Design a protein around this motif. Structure first.
Motif, PDB file in Angstrom:
ATOM      1  N   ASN A  43      71.220   0.082  25.049  1.00 63.20           N
ATOM      2  CA  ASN A  43      69.920  -0.320  25.031  1.00 63.20           C
ATOM      3  C   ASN A  43      69.632   1.270  25.708  1.00 63.20           C
ATOM      4  O   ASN A  43      68.412   1.904  26.552  1.00 63.20           O
ATOM      5  CB  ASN A  43      69.102  -1.235  25.765  1.00 63.20           C
ATOM      6  N   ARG A  44      70.411   2.043  26.280  1.00 59.01           N
ATOM      7  CA  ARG A  44      70.507   3.311  27.117  1.00 59.01           C
ATOM      8  C   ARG A  44      69.167   3.859  25.778  1.00 59.01           C
ATOM      9  O   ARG A  44      69.332   3.677  24.749  1.00 59.01           O
ATOM     10  CB  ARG A  44      71.339   4.046  26.863  1.00 59.01           C
ATOM     11  N   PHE A  45      69.013   5.340  26.650  1.00 55.13           N
ATOM     12  CA  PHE A  45      67.729   6.137  25.606  1.00 55.13           C
ATOM     13  C   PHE A  45      68.436   6.964  24.946  1.00 55.13           C
ATOM     14  O   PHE A  45      67.632   6.757  23.744  1.00 55.13           O
ATOM     15  CB  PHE A  45      67.025   6.900  27.210  1.00 55.13           C
ATOM     16  N   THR A  48      68.788   4.301  21.644  1.00 53.07           N
ATOM     17  CA  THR A  48      67.011   4.551  21.400  1.00 53.07           C
ATOM     18  C   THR A  48      66.233   5.959  20.319  1.00 53.07           C
ATOM     19  O   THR A  48      66.037   6.018  19.745  1.00 53.07           O
ATOM     20  CB  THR A  48      65.479   4.368  22.657  1.00 53.07           C
ATOM     21  N   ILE A  49      67.229   7.197  21.155  1.00 57.86           N
ATOM     22  CA  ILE A  49      65.975   7.960  20.258  1.00 57.86           C
ATOM     23  C   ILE A  49      67.476   8.154  18.767  1.00 57.86           C
ATOM     24  O   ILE A  49      66.526   8.092  18.039  1.00 57.86           O
ATOM     25  CB  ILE A  49      67.037   9.464  21.131  1.00 57.86           C
ATOM     26  N   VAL A  79      66.328  13.903  23.747  1.00 57.87           N
ATOM     27  CA  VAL A  79      65.309  13.735  23.372  1.00 57.87           C
ATOM     28  C   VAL A  79      64.382  14.476  22.238  1.00 57.87           C
ATOM     29  O   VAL A  79      64.026  14.300  22.285  1.00 57.87           O
ATOM     30  CB  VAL A  79      64.464  13.473  24.865  1.00 57.87           C
TER      31      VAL A  79
END
Ligand code: NA
Ligand code: NA
Ligand SMILES: [Zn+2]
Ligand SMILES: [Zn+2]
Lengths: 85, 85
Positions: A43-45, A48-49, A79
């Motif tokens: 679930n790290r960002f 997510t990206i 990001v």
């Protein structure tokens, strides 16, 4: 690889199987199962990206296969990748 | 509200506390804990969209407070919200 902790092929195969079974909330339910099996690193960002780039493409259109291949080649989980993926 | 299932204030307060403690992987670890407490509905894609909008803003800049207030007012979790959030 920099995204190995995200288990993204595992996510892909989960989503494909879940949608083949016509189940509700496949994105959520696959995310949850992968968390239960492989932990918080999925679930790290940056995960997510990548997932958002892939799933927006797979939602807003079709050929899940080009959505996967393109994200996998051009998205590192920065990001800034949202601007073009 | 349409995003009540996402528990986003809970996520916000988790991330703020985790970052105050200077811990590693706060986005991942808060996501995971909220999944453990409130289940798979917190990982739906509309939740992901809101969180990504909020966290990109909070990453690429500062004042977590305007990042929250702006996302909360203008983002419904539609995939199209990425274009402007
Ligand atoms: Na995620
Ligand atoms: Na998420
Ligand atoms: Zn596995
Ligand atoms: Zn709670």
């Amino acid at each position: 690889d920099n995204l190995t902790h995200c288990r993204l092929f595992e996510f892909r195969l989960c989503l494909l199987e879940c949608m083949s079974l016509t189940l509700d909330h496949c994105y959520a339910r696959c995310t949850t199962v992968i968390t239960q099996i492989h932990g918080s690193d999925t679930n790290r960002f940056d995960c997510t990206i990548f997932k958002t780039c892939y799933y927006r493409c797979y939602v807003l259109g079709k050929t899940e296969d080009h959505c996967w291949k393109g994200t996998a080649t051009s998205v590192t989980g920065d990001v800034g990748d949202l601007e073009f993926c």
